[PDB]
Tab-separated table of N, CA and C in Angstrom:
chain	number	residue	atom	x	y	z
S	1	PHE	N	44.417	144.707	2.523
S	1	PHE	CA	44.277	143.563	1.628
S	1	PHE	C	44.358	142.298	2.474
S	2	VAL	N	44.216	141.151	1.813
S	2	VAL	CA	44.293	139.845	2.456
S	2	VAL	C	45.288	138.989	1.687
S	3	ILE	N	46.204	138.352	2.411
S	3	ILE	CA	47.233	137.506	1.829
S	3	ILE	C	47.380	136.256	2.689
S	4	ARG	N	48.248	135.353	2.245
S	4	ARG	CA	48.477	134.110	2.963
S	4	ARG	C	49.090	134.385	4.331
S	5	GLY	N	48.778	133.510	5.287
S	5	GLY	CA	49.323	133.672	6.623
S	5	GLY	C	50.836	133.577	6.652
S	6	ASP	N	51.400	132.644	5.886
S	6	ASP	CA	52.844	132.453	5.865
S	6	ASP	C	53.574	133.506	5.043
S	7	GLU	N	52.864	134.277	4.225
S	7	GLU	CA	53.477	135.322	3.417
S	7	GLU	C	53.523	136.667	4.126
S	8	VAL	N	53.012	136.753	5.355
S	8	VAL	CA	53.018	138.026	6.067
S	8	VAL	C	54.442	138.535	6.227
S	9	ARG	N	55.360	137.656	6.629
S	9	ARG	CA	56.754	138.058	6.773
S	9	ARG	C	57.353	138.515	5.452
S	10	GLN	N	56.742	138.143	4.327
S	10	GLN	CA	57.208	138.589	3.021
S	10	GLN	C	56.892	140.055	2.757
S	11	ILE	N	56.104	140.699	3.623
S	11	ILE	CA	55.687	142.081	3.400
S	11	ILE	C	56.649	143.104	3.985
S	12	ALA	N	57.650	142.675	4.746
S	12	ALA	CA	58.539	143.619	5.399
S	12	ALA	C	59.370	144.375	4.363
S	13	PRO	N	59.831	145.580	4.695
S	13	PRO	CA	60.642	146.340	3.738
S	13	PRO	C	61.927	145.605	3.395
S	14	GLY	N	62.371	145.782	2.156
S	14	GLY	CA	63.589	145.125	1.709
S	14	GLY	C	63.497	143.616	1.729
S	15	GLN	N	62.380	143.067	1.266
S	15	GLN	CA	62.149	141.631	1.242
S	15	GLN	C	62.107	141.131	-0.196
S	16	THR	N	62.132	139.809	-0.333
S	16	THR	CA	62.034	139.151	-1.625
S	16	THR	C	60.984	138.053	-1.550
S	17	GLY	N	60.424	137.723	-2.698
S	17	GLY	CA	59.366	136.734	-2.777
S	17	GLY	C	58.365	137.115	-3.844
S	18	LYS	N	57.460	136.179	-4.124
S	18	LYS	CA	56.473	136.399	-5.177
S	18	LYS	C	55.631	137.638	-4.892
S	19	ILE	N	55.066	137.719	-3.686
S	19	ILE	CA	54.189	138.836	-3.340
S	19	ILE	C	54.930	140.155	-3.515
S	20	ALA	N	56.030	140.322	-2.780
S	20	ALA	CA	56.747	141.592	-2.796
S	20	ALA	C	57.241	141.933	-4.196
S	21	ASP	N	57.658	140.927	-4.961
S	21	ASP	CA	58.223	141.184	-6.279
S	21	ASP	C	57.161	141.533	-7.310
S	22	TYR	N	55.921	141.080	-7.123
S	22	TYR	CA	54.907	141.213	-8.160
S	22	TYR	C	53.798	142.194	-7.800
S	23	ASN	N	53.123	142.013	-6.667
S	23	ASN	CA	51.858	142.702	-6.437
S	23	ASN	C	51.926	143.838	-5.429
S	24	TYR	N	52.850	143.804	-4.468
S	24	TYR	CA	52.895	144.844	-3.439
S	24	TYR	C	54.327	144.945	-2.922
S	25	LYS	N	55.048	145.962	-3.379
S	25	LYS	CA	56.440	146.178	-3.012
S	25	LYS	C	56.530	147.335	-2.029
S	26	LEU	N	57.213	147.107	-0.907
S	26	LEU	CA	57.451	148.180	0.047
S	26	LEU	C	58.834	148.778	-0.165
S	27	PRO	N	58.998	150.089	-0.014
S	27	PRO	CA	60.323	150.685	-0.197
S	27	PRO	C	61.273	150.281	0.919
S	28	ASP	N	62.567	150.326	0.599
S	28	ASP	CA	63.579	149.934	1.574
S	28	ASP	C	63.552	150.844	2.794
S	29	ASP	N	63.329	152.141	2.586
S	29	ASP	CA	63.271	153.111	3.671
S	29	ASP	C	61.840	153.387	4.117
S	30	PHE	N	60.968	152.387	4.034
S	30	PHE	CA	59.585	152.576	4.442
S	30	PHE	C	59.520	153.013	5.898
S	31	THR	N	58.660	153.989	6.172
S	31	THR	CA	58.418	154.481	7.521
S	31	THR	C	56.943	154.298	7.836
S	32	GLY	N	56.651	153.555	8.888
S	32	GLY	CA	55.282	153.297	9.273
S	32	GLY	C	55.181	151.984	10.019
S	33	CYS	N	53.945	151.510	10.150
S	33	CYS	CA	53.647	150.293	10.888
S	33	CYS	C	52.874	149.330	10.004
S	34	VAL	N	53.133	148.040	10.189
S	34	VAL	CA	52.430	146.972	9.490
S	34	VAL	C	51.656	146.179	10.531
S	35	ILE	N	50.343	146.085	10.348
S	35	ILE	CA	49.460	145.398	11.281
S	35	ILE	C	48.746	144.285	10.532
S	36	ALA	N	48.817	143.071	11.073
S	36	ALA	CA	48.198	141.906	10.462
S	36	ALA	C	47.552	141.053	11.541
S	37	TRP	N	46.525	140.304	11.146
S	37	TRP	CA	45.857	139.392	12.062
S	37	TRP	C	45.002	138.426	11.257
S	38	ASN	N	44.983	137.168	11.689
S	38	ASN	CA	44.242	136.143	10.968
S	38	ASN	C	42.765	136.503	10.891
S	39	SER	N	42.171	136.255	9.729
S	39	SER	CA	40.745	136.447	9.503
S	39	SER	C	40.141	135.191	8.900
S	40	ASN	N	40.562	134.029	9.401
S	40	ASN	CA	40.098	132.768	8.837
S	40	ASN	C	38.587	132.633	8.963
S	41	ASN	N	38.064	132.789	10.180
S	41	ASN	CA	36.638	132.589	10.409
S	41	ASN	C	35.784	133.631	9.702
S	42	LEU	N	36.344	134.800	9.394
S	42	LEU	CA	35.582	135.877	8.779
S	42	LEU	C	35.684	135.901	7.261
S	43	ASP	N	36.734	135.319	6.688
S	43	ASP	CA	36.957	135.358	5.248
S	43	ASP	C	36.915	133.980	4.611
S	44	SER	N	37.674	133.020	5.135
S	44	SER	CA	37.694	131.692	4.541
S	44	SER	C	36.303	131.076	4.580
S	45	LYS	N	35.916	130.455	3.473
S	45	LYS	CA	34.607	129.838	3.337
S	45	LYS	C	34.724	128.328	3.484
S	46	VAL	N	33.692	127.725	4.077
S	46	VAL	CA	33.688	126.277	4.261
S	46	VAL	C	33.835	125.573	2.918
S	47	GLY	N	33.151	126.072	1.893
S	47	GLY	CA	33.266	125.529	0.557
S	47	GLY	C	34.466	126.002	-0.227
S	48	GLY	N	35.271	126.899	0.340
S	48	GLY	CA	36.440	127.414	-0.344
S	48	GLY	C	36.216	128.791	-0.930
A	1	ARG	N	76.208	139.910	-6.476
A	1	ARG	CA	76.099	138.754	-5.600
A	1	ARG	C	75.141	138.954	-4.435
A	2	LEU	N	74.744	140.187	-4.131
A	2	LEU	CA	73.850	140.435	-3.009
A	2	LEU	C	72.693	141.329	-3.430
A	3	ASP	N	71.568	141.166	-2.738
A	3	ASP	CA	70.420	142.030	-2.955
A	3	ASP	C	70.680	143.408	-2.350
A	4	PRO	N	70.038	144.447	-2.871
A	4	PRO	CA	70.378	145.820	-2.466
A	4	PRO	C	70.303	146.013	-0.962
A	5	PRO	N	69.258	145.504	-0.303
A	5	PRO	CA	69.099	145.805	1.130
A	5	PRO	C	70.297	145.411	1.972
A	6	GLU	N	70.966	144.313	1.634
A	6	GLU	CA	72.159	143.905	2.362
A	6	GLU	C	73.438	144.401	1.707
A	7	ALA	N	73.462	144.493	0.376
A	7	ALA	CA	74.633	145.011	-0.316
A	7	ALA	C	74.939	146.440	0.091
A	8	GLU	N	73.938	147.185	0.557
A	8	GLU	CA	74.210	148.533	1.035
A	8	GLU	C	75.177	148.509	2.209
A	9	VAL	N	75.083	147.493	3.067
A	9	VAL	CA	75.985	147.408	4.213
A	9	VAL	C	77.423	147.209	3.746
A	10	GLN	N	77.631	146.269	2.824
A	10	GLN	CA	78.976	146.023	2.321
A	10	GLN	C	79.520	147.246	1.600
A	11	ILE	N	78.684	147.895	0.791
A	11	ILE	CA	79.134	149.080	0.079
A	11	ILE	C	79.498	150.175	1.067
A	12	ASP	N	78.753	150.281	2.166
A	12	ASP	CA	79.084	151.276	3.176
A	12	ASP	C	80.422	150.965	3.827
A	13	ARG	N	80.693	149.687	4.087
A	13	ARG	CA	81.995	149.319	4.637
A	13	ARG	C	83.115	149.727	3.690
A	14	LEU	N	82.951	149.423	2.403
A	14	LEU	CA	83.973	149.785	1.427
A	14	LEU	C	84.139	151.295	1.340
A	15	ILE	N	83.031	152.033	1.375
A	15	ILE	CA	83.106	153.486	1.301
A	15	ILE	C	83.868	154.033	2.494
A	16	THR	N	83.578	153.523	3.689
A	16	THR	CA	84.294	153.985	4.871
A	16	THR	C	85.784	153.708	4.739
A	17	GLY	N	86.140	152.500	4.303
A	17	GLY	CA	87.551	152.171	4.174
A	17	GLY	C	88.267	153.067	3.182
A	18	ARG	N	87.677	153.250	2.003
A	18	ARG	CA	88.339	154.042	0.974
A	18	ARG	C	88.392	155.515	1.357
A	19	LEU	N	87.351	156.019	2.021
A	19	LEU	CA	87.380	157.395	2.495
A	19	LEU	C	88.480	157.591	3.525
A	20	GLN	N	88.656	156.621	4.423
A	20	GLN	CA	89.743	156.717	5.389
A	20	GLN	C	91.094	156.711	4.690
A	21	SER	N	91.247	155.871	3.666
A	21	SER	CA	92.500	155.853	2.918
A	21	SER	C	92.773	157.212	2.285
A	22	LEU	N	91.748	157.809	1.678
A	22	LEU	CA	91.924	159.120	1.062
A	22	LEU	C	92.299	160.171	2.095
A	23	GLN	N	91.639	160.157	3.252
A	23	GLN	CA	91.954	161.144	4.279
A	23	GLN	C	93.389	160.992	4.756
A	24	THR	N	93.834	159.752	4.961
A	24	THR	CA	95.218	159.533	5.363
A	24	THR	C	96.178	160.073	4.316
A	25	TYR	N	95.904	159.794	3.042
A	25	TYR	CA	96.785	160.277	1.987
A	25	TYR	C	96.839	161.796	1.969
A	26	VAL	N	95.689	162.451	2.115
A	26	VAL	CA	95.663	163.906	2.046
A	26	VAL	C	96.401	164.514	3.229
A	27	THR	N	96.248	163.935	4.419
A	27	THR	CA	96.982	164.455	5.568
A	27	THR	C	98.485	164.303	5.370
A	28	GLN	N	98.920	163.140	4.880
A	28	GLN	CA	100.339	162.959	4.604
A	28	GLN	C	100.828	163.993	3.606
A	29	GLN	N	100.040	164.248	2.563
A	29	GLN	CA	100.444	165.227	1.563
A	29	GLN	C	100.533	166.621	2.162
A	30	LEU	N	99.598	166.978	3.040
A	30	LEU	CA	99.649	168.296	3.663
A	30	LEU	C	100.928	168.464	4.470
A	31	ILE	N	101.277	167.454	5.264
A	31	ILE	CA	102.481	167.566	6.084
A	31	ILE	C	103.729	167.627	5.206
A	32	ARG	N	103.792	166.776	4.183
A	32	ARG	CA	104.939	166.797	3.284
A	32	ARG	C	105.045	168.134	2.566
A	33	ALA	N	103.908	168.725	2.203
A	33	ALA	CA	103.926	170.025	1.551
A	33	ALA	C	104.419	171.101	2.499
A	34	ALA	N	104.088	170.991	3.783
A	34	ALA	CA	104.651	171.925	4.751
A	34	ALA	C	106.170	171.821	4.775
A	35	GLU	N	106.690	170.593	4.798
A	35	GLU	CA	108.142	170.424	4.784
A	35	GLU	C	108.750	171.029	3.526
A	36	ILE	N	108.136	170.762	2.374
A	36	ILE	CA	108.685	171.256	1.118
A	36	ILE	C	108.612	172.773	1.064
A	37	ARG	N	107.558	173.364	1.625
A	37	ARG	CA	107.473	174.818	1.659
A	37	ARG	C	108.577	175.403	2.520
A	38	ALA	N	108.868	174.777	3.658
A	38	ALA	CA	109.985	175.246	4.470
A	38	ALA	C	111.282	175.192	3.674
A	39	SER	N	111.507	174.081	2.973
A	39	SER	CA	112.726	173.946	2.183
A	39	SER	C	112.786	174.984	1.069
A	40	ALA	N	111.653	175.260	0.426
A	40	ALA	CA	111.636	176.227	-0.664
A	40	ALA	C	111.856	177.640	-0.152
A	41	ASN	N	111.320	177.961	1.025
A	41	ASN	CA	111.604	179.258	1.624
A	41	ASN	C	113.087	179.395	1.923
A	42	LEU	N	113.698	178.336	2.454
A	42	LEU	CA	115.137	178.376	2.687
A	42	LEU	C	115.896	178.563	1.383
A	43	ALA	N	115.468	177.882	0.322
A	43	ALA	CA	116.151	178.010	-0.961
A	43	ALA	C	116.022	179.419	-1.516
A	44	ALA	N	114.842	180.022	-1.391
A	44	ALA	CA	114.664	181.391	-1.860
A	44	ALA	C	115.544	182.351	-1.079
A	45	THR	N	115.614	182.174	0.240
A	45	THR	CA	116.487	183.022	1.039
A	45	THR	C	117.942	182.843	0.632
A	46	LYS	N	118.366	181.600	0.402
A	46	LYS	CA	119.738	181.365	-0.030
A	46	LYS	C	120.008	182.035	-1.365
A	47	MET	N	119.076	181.929	-2.309
A	47	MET	CA	119.259	182.607	-3.586
A	47	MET	C	119.442	184.098	-3.372
A	48	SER	N	118.517	184.716	-2.641
A	48	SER	CA	118.559	186.162	-2.466
A	48	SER	C	119.847	186.602	-1.789
A	49	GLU	N	120.315	185.842	-0.804
A	49	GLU	CA	121.396	186.312	0.047
A	49	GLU	C	122.776	185.868	-0.410
């Protein structure tokens, strides 16, 4: 998925915030890896 | 007062403390029961003899 750049840290297990609380919650004992990278030039549009 | 992810740490501290208290109490009771058993064996021998 794609989310705000500043909300990436909100995705860690055992976190709080709008994203984690509403649309995508990770379990406290989550096992795995989280990989993120900016996609501004590929997703953001000049017109919005 | 705390969210689960951090409250688990505090609850674990409390669990460790209370478990240690219980273990200490049980060990004391075991030793005291050994003493009382010795005394009761002596009392039974005194009764019989």
